[PDB]
Amino acid sequence: SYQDVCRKAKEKLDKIEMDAKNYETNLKEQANNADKTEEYRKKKKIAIEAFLKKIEEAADKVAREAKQRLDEEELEKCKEEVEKRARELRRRIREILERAKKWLDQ
């Protein structure tokens, strides 16, 4: 049903968002203290970008599949809600990357 599809897509996006927040918390807590050379910063930035781009692939897949299922009344309200949730997740993922680059450039 459109109700189950909506609820499940939102639940999956919430899980991806929490995984991104937990990853960010783990960066600040578990990362080791070494000489922050230009090379160290570039190596860490490319890995963080790769990790966050893979989180974005998961969010994109959940959103595209939810929209596709809702396409095949209140169904339009659900599509708007899932798309708004996908956009906000994308902005949050972008804000994590920006804070991480600022954190490495300290």
Numbering used by the authors: 5 to 76, 86 to 119
Direct quotes from the study:
PfRH5 is the best understood component of PfPCRCR and interacts with human membrane protein complexes containing the erythrocyte receptor basigin. Antibodies which target PfRH5 are highly effective at preventing erythrocyte invasion and the most potent growth-inhibitory antibodies bind a single epitope. Here we use structure-guided approaches to design a small synthetic immunogen, RH5-34EM which recapitulates this epitope. Structural biology and biophysics demonstrate that RH5-34EM is correctly folded and binds neutralising monoclonal antibodies with nanomolar affinity.
The most effective growth-inhibitory antibody from this panel, R5.016, bound to an epitope which overlapped that of 9AD4. We previously determined the structure of the R5.016 bound to PfRH5 and find that 13/15 of the residues on PfRH5 contacted by R5.016 are retained in our epitope mimic designs. R5.016 bound with lower affinity to RH5-34EM than PfRH5, although still in the nanomolar range (115 nM vs 2.4 nM). We next determined crystal structures of the RH5-34EM epitope mimic bound to scFv fragments of human monoclonal antibodies R5.016 (at 1.63 Å resolution) and R5.034 (at 1.75 Å resolution). Comparison of these structures with those of PfRH5 bound to R5.016 and R5.034 showed significant similarity, both in the fold of the epitope mimic and in the interactions that it makes with antibodies. Of the 15 interactions formed between PfRH5 and R5.016, 13 were retained with the epitope mimic. In the case of R5.034, of the 10 interactions made with PfRH5, 9 were also observed with the epitope mimic. These structural alignments also confirmed that RH5-34EM more correctly recapitulates the epitope for R5.034 than that for R5.016, with R5.034 binding closer to the centre of the RH5-34EM immunogen, while R5.016 binds more towards the tip of the immunogen, where the structural similarity to PfRH5 starts to diverge. Production of our focused immunogen involved grafting the 9AD4/R5.016/R5.034 epitope onto a small scaffold protein and redesigning the resultant molecule to ensure that it folds correctly. This was successful, with structural studies showing that both R5.016 and R5.034 bind to the synthetic immunogen with the expected binding mode.
